[PDB]
Design a protein around this ligand. Structure first.
Ligand SMILES: [Mg+2]
Lengths: 226, 244, 195, 241, 250, 231, 204, 196, 243
């Protein structure tokens, strides 16, 4: 997995590749690693996929209830604190490595969080197996006062480094943009640089090819009237 | 301390009755009448809603008849909320039995456990009993079609035909008169309605003041179908038996 | 405990179970009955870790005898085998799991059919025409795969079993001191007292 | 009538223990008042030291709950301190869990929910207190939220509590009918304190020395209470106008 | 300490009444009038913001509450009892549904849950019943729009339209005259506003009236874009201004 | 009257009736006397029988080698309280290798009895105790009442007609306080004191119970023939 | 000793035009020993289909569990559970055993009865959802199944074409796995008929 | 980590490097290891980032609640709360923390809490992997009652050497000044301190 | 009515009669006082000599908490001890976590909240004592008095028990006629006087005087009992003032 987060002028952007692997095998070619915690707080997850999904939804649920209770729009530091205290308690066994970002009444924020519950702050971050490929690009092209367009470009360039150079990452680039005073725009499959080429042959079979012993209509209906 | 305010819900009167059970039964006697009739080829459940308003949504409504599993249903007379607590317990017990033995729960076993729960509230814990009497209509492959009732005491008994709620004395007499053992479902449907027609405290019996259900062999071969009547179907069966 | 076999013929289920009990270096007994009657038409044989086998078998027996009294009714073999599977599946994630494998042979009086169920200590259940636990199947399944017919008589089943036990006596390293054979049919459970 | 002794319904659907707790609220015979400026929230309360043996400095019904939130209580001191300690514990826990300072209105809701429970659960009695919470909230600005033994709470433009609350209330209502705004249009909190004291004098028809009052002020990022001499400086300025 | 009230505080009297439930219903009767009307393409729930003092800021007190993005609730009776039920109702929508099925509960089932909580306060040890009746309006894919009333006993009923509290008997009669199965949502709002004027003494405007709808999906209220199947909340609280625009059209 | 149903209720005059009723059980109890010099402390107790076929209820209990008490009132309550003392004496020995001071034993007894006077469902203890012991600061006599009040004295008495013995001791004070180095004289004086509380009856061989503890004497009980010397 | 490959077996599912297909082998073994040739791994709750590979006791247990939960769901909701919802219930249920999991690889297949959309999904033993347009694979021959599906699959196949494709993908994958085979079943699922076909295959 | 805290005439200064490490990979090169638990009670963190953050967050909570009830806590009190956490959880923590604060009665104070959870009040303290290389230097160059500038120089030079030799340390040198005059943050970049 | 039969019940006035009944037991007890001085506090109490048999000096009533706090109380003595035991647990746990000894104002609230807790439930009875306590902390001297309601304040001087009005009057005089301060040794003497003067209301039996003090200068901020020479000196001072 490759995930990044980049701050810009008036907000924050996160991106991620779309490959999930079982050892050397690609289980899903178009995985969604960008998670919504609240409308304007999204986080990218690397590590154990079930853990990143589960911990993201639990905290998301509790954040929603908190927002309703306080009559306030949720803040990123709350999602951060809730995530880290949960993860720390499980001493790393919940394998969720997250880049947490969003906008709230306080401003725009970017954090990352390791599975053991240690957190950090920055203008640009990366996590996952492709984090070194990504970080090399971030350390090469990042500057102060990025515009929205510059940050999207930098973020997806860093995901591409991971896609091309890391065997743990591949397929497509997802992006989410969180700008102050605007709706978050989740850009699913922002890039598509890995369409499979056309096959040499069609493997559609002549009907009747397969040997059959028995057929039966399976009854999916409930018990019938009359 | 707190003893001062304790009603003591689980004590005997000097006559040896359980005060709270008797008073709960008293509450139940003001509830909409529910009738169950058992036939050779099926079971009928009919029950009267408590006096409705024209603005009540009837088609999306359930107050009296509840599905316990695919082969067992109940008619309720008493506090609806109390009954739902017990209904969900019963639904869960049915599934535990199915999970454990990979066979649908025999009707009596489900009835006994619910009755046993009610009983507990009369002997320990200092809580008020459930203000509910049930009519259980169900089928299993040991005893076939079965009717039971249970009340807040936790006592249950089996029936060919029975009523609970308001005017049971009147209704039981009318059932005792016209019920015969070789009776069929379509006859039983008619008897159930005819009885409510005569025992109701309302001016007349309309579709919108009723819930109705049948359990029939009426499916394709050795199996059983539960039919909770839609408002239209009750209106049709009311016309068809010439009550409107 | 070592070898336990089951075969389901036309109208009955036959269970054969080794008689030896070995405490490491010595054979302590050569007449051990590795079976418990669960109900008049259901028999369960067992093999696995010492102590746990009998403890489990008797526990199941008590539960089924309790059920029989409460409902005044005999549970079907399928129902009994499902209860037993659940208890083992329960146990496999316990603090200390039952290491017990069982064969349940019953005659279903409702469907008038003999039924044989194979369940290992993990709670892995399977209905079979014939079955075994441990190494027993390795020696005997090729004979049963050859000779077995769904319409065999009880005596044809016993002859096929006789052959199975002879292969075991030829090729197994352990002396298991013969087998006790029991038949489960419409009239209940009886023991073949000569084998 | 045991429906009088615990929090169960009377036949008219009332909770007498809640009502009688409201009566304990006035047992101290103190009146309090809160108003909002542009930048601040001021709360003033009468201070009465009858015994010459008391240490006057230890006599207070104003509490610093957090850096930002202040709380004045109308009711007996033991229930007041019970409520104060809890609110302090609740505000600190909130900060630790959610990573920002507990808002005035949220703390008020939380204490209101705790009070509600005592109206529903038999073994817990209601507290004989009314809690007025003040702050300059980072999202909502100057804030007054008040709690009572029924578990009710609401935000206020300004408010008063105590035996003579009605006189003070109407005095304040009449001012806002005139000025037509939500707050005291005043720059410095010093002048908002002066407004508060002035309008308490008019409504109560009583004159105050420096030891007859007790003042709390909330600004952005701190709530503080004034000393005798800060109040004296305030009284003097009022007299010269 | 410890709660040593482990016995029921609600019990059957010799006549079979459950005293505390009746007394709780009485507390509801004293309560301010609130109502709900079901249209073909929406539901509206409404009530009076009876402000205690004019120094109180009554928009800080929410009588109409979002439970889920497609479910709203209003009450008549004791406000504090309502506030905690809403807290519990919101949480139970998550714990016993959304955390399991990955979607919000349908109106009837969330109501079923709120009802359960209220039933338990009617039988559990050391508690009194809740002194409120709720009207819960909502939408879900397989049942469409619905409106439910929930009483202190825990009983709940589906309504085409109803009212509860102070002027409920008169209001229900008003609604019987005007309700039909062909009302569009704007018509139901108009009727709700007419019905509510009857039971309101003093000022009657967008600042003394609280009113919300369960209607169309509001993608502008979602807060993000880019998931085609997330189309936004159907619950919407009408603004003070929105209400007043409909009071001249009255 | 309306305020005596349980221990958790005060009367309008500020009294605790359940505690006062517990105090009454002591007064119906048989008389017992305690007194001390600077070297020894003595308990004397009149044992009551049920009738002429019965034994005479034992009134003195040993708590440690250097401590013990006599009881007046509900006997099972004395057994519970004396057992608690046996443990506290024991814990002090096992953990600190220290013999428990009589003063501490009093404080612990006060605090145990007190908890039963402030909580629902409990009842006060229905027994009074005279605790003697010899520790690092010499001889001690304590009077325990189930209200929780523990008092250190030179001498005292509790039970039916204990008032007689109490004044005798109030007179004898300057005499018996001086009886250092003579055990048998201190007992003699205690037996004389308890005799102010007799009427209709007098001291017999199976009527009388004496206990003594002191400088070079373990707490030991004398019953039966071993008290004839003092009759 | 590795629980997910003690008993053996495979499941594959595919989408076509207004239909889905789910298929499984019938083998159950204790490692090298074949034990049963009739251990079906596909179950259904109303119109939602669930295949489960892995440790057989957990396969049985989970079927029994989802039958339990979908039955109660139906009674309360007054309607049959949809594939999207069931998928979430499967995920929830597995993750609830995060640190002592069921050793399984479940696969969900069905058509949404309201929208008509065909739906498949796969899970790891710990609840992670793989919602693929094309196909889902599971079991001891999952590598082989990925190989077959990746070349054999094309989108929008008609039910009886999809049948050939999924059958061939299963059969040839099973024949390169020691622990799969001994029979096979294919379910072809359309909005209102479901056809179940048993395949003829080698029995070694 | 290279961290230190030094008492001087007007109070105390805390100093740290900015490197966070997962093996040889620098996970963060601009980390803030100087953390605030009260207005004028701060700490330097070394060891597990997860552990030291969790500890500091808890301590901040305790001291906020302390303040609400009893007013401003002493630096000694803050150190004791840290110690309680570190000592009672010694088996599950990897945390070496220096606690530094400024009272008005007590002036500048420094308490070091090593791995076992013992407490040691010192005139100055050094810790982290980088500290080993500057025991010699710091012992030779520390005097009591230095000026603000001398103390800033001492820390700058000391941590410069620690960074020079310890690969685990690096980045910028952060400092936090604690006096009666308030709270001052300082930062020194590679090109300044490397050439020293 | 019936409102006074159960603790934690509000009467229709808004009062808790059971707490008020507890006060009656306090008023029924022996007199006890506290005087705040320049750098410390002094505590004194009247001990009724019920009998000649009471070993003098040996039924000590004043109690220490930690090393710097003194507590005295009038009313039900066991209730007072129970409260002091809790006070000692509260002080130990404060010291344990925070290192510094518990400040006096902080200590007062610990007792305050605990006593107030016994007015929240019908399953407990309120405390049958008023407790005078205090000492020297890092911020100087503090004297407190705490009622059965849980109400407490800081005092210049305080008294409670049967002779409380007599003592209150005497305390007000010192406050007026020493408005710039009272020394520790002065306070010890005055305490003796006031207890002797307040003994009029308990005159059937004669009594034993008991004094303690914490003073920054005279006891190093630690709590000590006044024994022997300093005690005898103050006994004399008081005996001269009644004639
Ligand atoms: Mg093979």
């Amino acid at each position: 997995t490759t995930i990044v987060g980049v701050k810009f002028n008036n907000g924050v952007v996160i991106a991620a590749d779309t490959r999930s692997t079982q050892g050397p095998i690609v289980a899903d070619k178009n995985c969604a690693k960008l998670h919504r915690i609240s409308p304007k707080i999204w986080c990218a997850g690397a590590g154990t996929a079930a853990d990143t999904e589960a911990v993201t939804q639990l905290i998301g649920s509790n954040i929603e209830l908190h927002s309703l209770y306080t009559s306030r729009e949720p803040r990123v530091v709350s999602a951060l604190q809730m995530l880290k205290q949960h993860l720390f308690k499980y001493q790393g066994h919940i394998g969720a490595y997250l880049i947490v970002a969003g906008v709230d009444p306080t401003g725009s924020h970017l954090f990352s969080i390791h599975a053991d519950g240690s957190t950090d702050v920055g203008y640009y971050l990366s996590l996952g197996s492709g984090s070194l490929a990504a970080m090399a690009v971030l350390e090469s092209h990042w500057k102060q006062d990025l515009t929205k367009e510059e940050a999207i470009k930098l973020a997806s360039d860093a995901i591409q480094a991971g896609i091309w150079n890391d065997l743990g990452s591949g397929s497509n680039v997802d992006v989410c943009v969180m700008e102050i005073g605007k709706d978050a725009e989740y850009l699913r499959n922002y890039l598509t640089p890995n369409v499979r080429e056309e096959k040499q042959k069609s493997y559609k079979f002549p009907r009747g090819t397969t040997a059959v012993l028995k057929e039966s209509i399976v009854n999916i209906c409930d018990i019938q009237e009359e | 301390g707190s003893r001062r305010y304790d009603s003591r819900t689980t004590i005997f009167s000097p006559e040896g009755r359980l005060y709270q059970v008797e008073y709960a039964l008293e509450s139940i006697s003001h509830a909409g009448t529910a009738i169950g009739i058992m036939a050779s080829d099926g079971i009928v459940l009919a029950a009267e809603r408590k006096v409705t308003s024209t603005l009540l949504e009837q088609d999306t409504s359930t107050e009296k008849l509840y599905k316990l599993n695919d082969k067992i249903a109940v008619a309720v007379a008493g506090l609806t909320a109390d009954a739902e607590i017990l209904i969900n317990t019963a639904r869960i017990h049915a599934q535990n039995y199915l999970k454990t033995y990979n066979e649908d729960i025999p009707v009596e076993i489900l009835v006994r456990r619910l009755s046993d729960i009610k009983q507990g509230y009369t002997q320990h814990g200092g809580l008020r009993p459930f203000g509910v009497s049930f009519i259980y209509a169900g089928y299993d492959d040991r005893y076939g079609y079965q009717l039971y009732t249970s009340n807040p005491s936790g006592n249950y008994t089996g029936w060919k035909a029975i009523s609970v709620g308001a005017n049971t004395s009147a209704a039981q007499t009318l059932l005792q008169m016209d019920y015969k053992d070789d009776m069929k479902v379509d006859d039983a449907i008619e008897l159930a309605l005819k009885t409510l027609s005569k025992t109701t405290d309302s001016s007349a019996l309309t579709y919108d003041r009723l819930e109705f259900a049948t359990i029939r062999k009426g499916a394709n071969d050795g199996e059983v179908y539960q039919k909770i009547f839609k408002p239209q179907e009750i209106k049709d069966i009311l016309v068809k038996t010439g009550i409107t | 405990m070592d070898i336990i076999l089951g075969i389901r013929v036309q109208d009955s289920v036959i269970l054969a179970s080794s008689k030896a009990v070995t405490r490491g270096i010595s054979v302590l007994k050569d007449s051990d009955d590795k079976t418990r009657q669960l109900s008049p038409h259901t028999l369960m044989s067992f093999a696995g870790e010492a102590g746990d086998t009998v403890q489990f078998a008797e526990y199941i027996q008590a539960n089924i005898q309790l059920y029989s009294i409460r409902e005044d009714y005999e549970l079907s073999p399928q129902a009994v085998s499902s209860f037993v599977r659940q208890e083992l599946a329960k146990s496999i994630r316990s603090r200390r799991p039952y290491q017990v494998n069982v064969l349940i042979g019953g005659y279903d009086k409702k469907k008038n059919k003999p039924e044989l169920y194979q369940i290992d200590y993990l709670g892995t259940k399977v209905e079979l025409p014939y079955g075994a636990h441990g190494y027993s199947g390795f020696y005997t399944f090729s004979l049963l795969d050859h000779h077995y017919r769904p319409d065999m008589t009880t005596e044809e089943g016993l002859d096929l079993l006789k052959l199975c036990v002879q292969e075991l006596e030829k090729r197994m390293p352990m002396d298991f001191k013969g087998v006790i054979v029991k038949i489960v049919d419409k009239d209940g459970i009886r023991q073949v007292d000569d084998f | 009538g045991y429906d009088r002794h615990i929090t169960i319904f009377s036949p008219e659907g009332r909770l007498y223990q809640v009502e009688y707790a409201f009566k304990a609220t006035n047992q101290t015979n103190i009146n309090s008042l809160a108003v909002r400026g542009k930048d601040c929230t001021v709360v003033i309360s009468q201070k009465k030291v009858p015994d010459k043996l008391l240490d006057p400095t230890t006599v207070s019904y104003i509490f610093c709950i957090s850096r930002t939130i202040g709380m004045v209580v109308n009711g007996p001191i033991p229930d007041a301190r019970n409520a104060a300690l809890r609110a302090k514990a609740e505000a600190a826990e909130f900060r630790y869990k959610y990573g920002y300072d507990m808002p005035c209105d949220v703390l008020a809701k939380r204490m209101a929910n705790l009070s509600q429970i005592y109206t529903q659960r038999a073994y817990m009695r209601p507290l004989g207190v009314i809690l007025t919470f003040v702050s300059v909230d980072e999202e909502l600005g100057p804030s007054i939220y008040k709690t009572d033994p029924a578990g009710y709470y609401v935000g206020y433009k300004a408010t008063a509590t105590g035996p003579k609350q009605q006189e003070i209330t109407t005095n304040l209502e009449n001012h806002f009918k005139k000025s037509k705004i939500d707050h005291i249009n005043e720059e410095s909190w010093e002048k908002v304190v002066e407004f508060a004291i002035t309008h308490m004098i008019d409504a109560l028809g009583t004159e105050f020395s420096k030891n007859d009052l007790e003042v709390g002020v909330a600004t952005k990022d701190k709530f503080f209470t004034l000393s005798a001499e800060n109040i004296e400086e305030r009284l003097v300025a009022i007299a010269e106008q | 300490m410890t709660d040593r009230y482990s016995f029921s505080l609600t019990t059957f009297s010799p006549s079979g009444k459950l005293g505390q439930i009746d007394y709780a219903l009485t507390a509801v009767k004293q309560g301010v009038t609130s109502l709900g009307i079901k249209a073909t393409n929406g539901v509206v729930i409404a009530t009076e913001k009876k402000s205690s003092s004019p120094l109180a800021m009554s928009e800080t007190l929410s009588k109409v509450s979002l439970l889920t993005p497609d479910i709203g609730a209003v009450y008549s009776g004791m406000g504090p009892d309502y506030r905690v039920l809403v807290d519990k109702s919101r949480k139970v929508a998550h714990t016993s549904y959304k955390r399991i099925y990955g979607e919000y509960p349908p109106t009837k089932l969330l109501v079923s849950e709120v009802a359960k909580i209220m039933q338990e306060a009617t039988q559990s040890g050391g508690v009194r019943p809740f002194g409120v009746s709720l009207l819960i309006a909502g939408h879900d894919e397989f049942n469409g729009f619905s409106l439910y009333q929930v009483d202190p006993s825990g009983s709940y009923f589906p309504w085409k339209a109803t009212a509860i509290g102070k002027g409920s008997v008169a209001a229900k009669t008003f609604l019987e005259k005007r309700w039909n199965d062909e009302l569009e949502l704007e018509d139901a709002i108009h009727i709700a506003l007419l019905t509510l004027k009857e039971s309101v003494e003093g000022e009657f405007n967008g600042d003394t009236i609280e009113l919300a709808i369960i209607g169309d999906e509001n993608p502008d209220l979602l807060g993000y874009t880019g998931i085609p199947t997330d189309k936004g909340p159907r619950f919407r609280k009408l603004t003070s201004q929105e209400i007043n625009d409909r009071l001249e059209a009255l | 009257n309306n305020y005596d149903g349980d221990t958790v209720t005060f009367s309008p005059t500020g009294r605790l009736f359940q505690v006062e009723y517990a105090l009454e059980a002591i007064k119906q109890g048989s008389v017992t006397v305690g007194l001390r010099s600077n070297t020894h402390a003595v308990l004397v107790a009149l044992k009551r029988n049920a009738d002429e076929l019965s034994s005479y209820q034992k009134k003195i209990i040993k708590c440690d080698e250097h401590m013990g008490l006599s009881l007046a009132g509900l006997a099972p309550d004395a057994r519970v309280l004396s057992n608690y003392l046996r443990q506290q004496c024991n814990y002090s020995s096992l953990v600190f290798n220290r013999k428990l001071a009589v003063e501490r034993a009093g404080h612990l007894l006060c605090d145990k009895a007190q908890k039963n006077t402030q909580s629902y469902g409990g009842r006060p203890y229905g027994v009074g105790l005279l605790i003697i012991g010899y520790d690092k600061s010499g001889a001690h006599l304590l009077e325990f009442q189930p209200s929780g009040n523990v008092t250190e004295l030179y001498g005292t008495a509790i039970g039916a007609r204990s008032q007689g013995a109490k004044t005798y001791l109030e007179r004898t004070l300057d005499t018996f306080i001086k009886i250092d180095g003579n055990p048998d004289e201190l007992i003699k004086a205690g037996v004389e004191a308890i005799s102010q509380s007799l009427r209709d009856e007098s001291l017999t061989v199976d009527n009388l119970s004496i206990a003594i503890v002191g400088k070079d004497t373990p707490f030991t009980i004398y019953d039966g023939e071993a008290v004839a010397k003092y009759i | 000793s590795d629980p997910s490959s003690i008993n053996g077996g495979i499941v594959v599912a595919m989408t076509g035009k207004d239909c889905v297909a789910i298929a499984c082998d019938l083998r159950l073994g204790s490692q090298s020993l074949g034990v049963s040739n009739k251990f079906e791994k596909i179950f259904h709750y109303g119109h939602v289909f669930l295949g489960i590979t892995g440790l057989a006791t957990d396969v049985t247990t989970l079927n029994e569990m989802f039958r339990y939960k979908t039955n109660l769901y139906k009674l309360k909701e007054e309607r049959a559970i949809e594939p999207e919802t069931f998928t979430q219930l499967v995920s929830s249920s597995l993750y609830e055993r995060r640190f002592g999991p069921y050793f399984v690889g479940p696969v969900v297949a069905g058509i949404n009865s309201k929208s008509g959309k065909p739906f498949i999904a796969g899970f790891d033993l710990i609840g992670c959802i793989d919602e693929a347009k094309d196909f889902i694979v599971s079991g001891t021959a999952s590598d082989q199944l990925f190989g077959m599906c990746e070349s054999l699959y094309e989108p929008n196949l008609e039910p009886e074409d999809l049948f050939e494709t999924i059958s061939q993908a299963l059969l040839n994958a099973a024949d390169r796995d020691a622990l799969s085979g001994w029979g096979a079943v294919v379910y072809i699922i359309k909005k209102d008929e479901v056809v179940k076909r048993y395949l003829k295959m080698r029995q070694d | 980590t290279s961290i230190m805290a030094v008492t001087f005439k007007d109070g105390v200064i805390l100093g740290a490097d900015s490197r966070t490490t997962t093996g040889a990979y620098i996970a963060n090169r601009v980390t803030d290891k100087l953390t605030r638990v009260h207005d004028k009670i701060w700490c330097c963190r070394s060891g597990s980032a997860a552990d030291t953050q969790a500890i500091a967050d808890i301590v901040q909570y305790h001291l906020e609640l302390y303040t609400s009830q009893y007013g401003t806590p002493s630096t000694e009190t803050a150190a004791s709360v840290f110690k309680e956490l570190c000592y009672e959880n010694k088996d599950n923590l990897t945390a070496g923390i220096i606690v530094a604060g400024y009272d008005d009665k007590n002036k500048g104070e420094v308490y070091t809490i090593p791995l076992g959870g013992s407490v040691h009040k010192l005139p100055y303290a050094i810790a982290g992997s980088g500290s080993t290389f500057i025991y010699g230097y710091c012992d030779k160059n520390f005097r009591e009652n230095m000026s603000k500038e001398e103390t800033v120089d001492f820390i700058k030079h000391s941590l410069s050497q620690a960074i020079k030799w310890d690969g685990s340390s690096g980045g910028v040198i952060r400092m936090v000044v604690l006096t009666a005059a308030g709270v001052e943050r300082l930062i020194f970049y590679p090109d300044e301190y490397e050439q020293l | 009515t019936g409102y006074d039969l159960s603790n934690s019940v509000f009467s229709p006035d808004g009062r808790n009669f059971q707490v008020e009944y507890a006060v009656k037991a306090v008023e029924n007890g022996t007199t006890s006082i506290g005087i705040k001085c320049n750098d410390g506090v002094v505590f004194a109490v009247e001990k009724l000599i019920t009998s000649k048999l009471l070993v003098p000096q040996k039924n000590v009533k004043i109690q220490v908490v930690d090393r710097h706090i003194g507590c005295v109380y009038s009313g039900l003595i066991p209730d007072g001890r129970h409260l002091v035991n809790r006070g000692r647990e509260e002080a130990a746990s404060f010291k344990k976590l925070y290192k510094t000894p518990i400040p006096i104002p902080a200590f007062a609230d610990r007792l305050g909240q605990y006593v107030q807790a016994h007015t929240l439930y019908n399953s407990v009875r309120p405390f049958g004592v008023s407790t005078i306590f205090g000492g020297v902390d890092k911020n100087g001297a503090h004297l407190y008095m705490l009622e059965p309601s849980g109400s407490y304040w800081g005092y210049k001087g305080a008294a409670t028990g049967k002779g409380r009005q007599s003592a209150k009057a005497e305390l007000e005089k010192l406050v007026d006629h020493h408005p710039e301060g009272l020394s520790a040794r002065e306070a010890v003497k005055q305490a003796a006087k006031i207890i002797y003067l307040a003994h009029e209301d308990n005159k059937e039996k004669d009594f034993e005087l008991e004094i303690s003090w914490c003073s920054l200068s005279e006891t190093n901020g630690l709590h000590k009992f006044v024994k022997g020479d300093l005690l005898q000196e103050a006994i004399d001072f008081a005996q001269k003032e009644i004639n």
